[model samples]
Target: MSNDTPFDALWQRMLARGWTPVSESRLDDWLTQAPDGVVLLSSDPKRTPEVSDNPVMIGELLREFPDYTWQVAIADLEQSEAIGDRFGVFRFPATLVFTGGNYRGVLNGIHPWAELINLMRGLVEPQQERAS
Candidate 1:
């Protein structure tokens, strides 16, 4: 099932797994729609192979935080770059976390499991504002 065009497989697999695709037109809607979760702004794997493992890592993250939703960008390199620039995500394969329609933080590049958890922790918590 694996091939040189990792990005293609990555995109397809993500789609199969029900990850929402965000494009420039859908950006605003996608951002505000989700209560919390990560949107992986993937770069072309031909240039940056580092993104190949991102989905796996994020899948694990999803397991850890079942309440959070997962999404992905369906843009090409240039478009992804533009979106990334808007969020200060210069590096490829960055994961942007949003909470309550607000940008919480980002995970750039591949990181260790422990560190990944530490960084992602508390980004998506149960709503307290609803009661208030």
Candidate 2:
């Protein structure tokens, strides 16, 4: 509900401009990236139609969402589909969001940043309330 939520704001900044360059997640780091949730940004140079669509930005997001800041990580394109497979097929410009170190939902394609913030609520609110 609040944009103050870590990923919520960065998610907007990402849509406004672009995603910042993030390190790829190691297969071993997959499950450990949890209790805080993680967004595995999946993209392929070959499959990616536009280079600009890639999620590469600066330290802007880290400052916004320090709590869940570690939530966003780029998936190793050629390294592993093992983690991405948990959600579904590997696709370009797709983000597999995992909460509690498991699959939460798949965010594909693109949408207005506002709509996306709203959309993310539906994805995360129910779970957040339940946990609370």
Candidate 3:
């Protein structure tokens, strides 16, 4: 989210889920802690529905579960563009999963918490072993 908007709640939730918050200035350092996997980025300062939900669900996920390791990149378009290029992001408020020092998948736009959580859980679970 933008610098003006308060994403403290979201950050807290992420912390709960073991998600780490990464600053645009410290991508390298953040990447070290994100080797296993991490939530790449998020931004919704003005709360644009086109970009994100009125109240972001990422925060709620952290609040509900506080033992995950998620990461976030909160900055403007310019900063986002830089990361996007490095990470190949094409949408706003995107959620990218970084594993093995690269992007494995991204959940773009604002999605309900259930959908997001299910997708996230799938990332850590092997498809052949999970129930359909």
Give the number of the best model, judged by TM-score.
Answer: 1
- The models' CA-based lDDT, in order, is 0.62, 0.46, 0.53
- Alpha-carbon RMSD, each predicted model: 6.6, 10.8, 6.0
Give one digit per residue, the lDDT tens place, for model 2 in 15-85: 45533334334533655744554455544434345443534422332334455644455544333355546
Per-model TM values vs. the true structure: 0.67, 0.51, 0.54
Task: Name the candidate, 2 or 3, with the larger lDDT value.
Answer: 3
For model 1, residues 1-132, the per-residue Cα lDDT tens digits are 245466676777777777766775567777777666666676654355555554567677757756555555455445577777776765656677776777766764355776566555644442422110
| Tens-digit lDDT track of model 3 for 1-132 | 355434556556445554444556666566665544444455443455553354357556434434544555444445555666666565555666666675556554345676666665565444733222
Error of 1 at 71 (Å): 4.7
Instruction: Check candidate 1 and list the clashing pairs.
Output: none
Off by over 4 Å in 1: 1-4, 45-51, 70-78, 109-111, 122-132
Q: Which stretches of candidate 2 lie above 4 Å from their native place? A: 1-25, 45-50, 54-70, 80-82, 86-93, 127-132
Ranking according to lDDT, highest score first: 1, 3, 2
Best by lDDT: 1
The superposed Cα distance between candidate 1 and the true structure at residue 29, in angstroms, equals 0.4
Give the better candidate number (1 or 2) by lDDT: 1
Residue 3 miss distance in model 1 (angstroms): 14
